[PDB]
Homo-oligomer: A and B are copies of this chain.
Amino acid sequence: GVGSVAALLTVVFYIAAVMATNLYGATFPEWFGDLSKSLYTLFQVMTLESWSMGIVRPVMNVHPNAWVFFIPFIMLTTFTVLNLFIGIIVDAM
């Protein structure tokens, strides 16, 4: 069902944005200072846009293991979207 996936992604996004605001908020305030800043940056990361050279590398220079957070977040959001976008398309057929 498509309703489960959009909700699943919404929940994952709030937990990750809390976790990111918590973990990296003090050291990276512009990208992770708020829940709302983090939601936006995690969205950018989901679009694969400058995620490594722009966000994750400058973070790993302070939090060398930040990659265990962001890579799986990516693999998770990316997968869920394809199952989601295909979900709506196929469901009407």
> Residues of A at under 8 Å CB distance from B?
40, 43-44, 47-54, 67, 71, 74, 79, 82-83, 85-86, 89
Indicate if the CB atoms of A44 and B49 lie closer than 8 Å.
Answer: no
Given A49-B52, A79-B85: 11 more A-B contacts, CB < 8 Å: A43-B71, A47-B52, A47-B74, A49-B50, A49-B51, A49-B53, A50-B50, A50-B53, A53-B54, A82-B89, A83-B89
Q: Report how far A74 CA is from B47 CA in the complex, Å.
A: 10
State how many angstroms separate the Cβ of A40 from the closest Cβ of chain B.
6
Contacts of A47 in B (CB 8 A): 48, 51-52, 74
Contacts of A67 in B (CB 8 A): 40
Contacts of A83 in B (CB 8 A): 89
Contacts of A85 in B (CB 8 A): 79, 82
Contacts of A86 in B (CB 8 A): 89
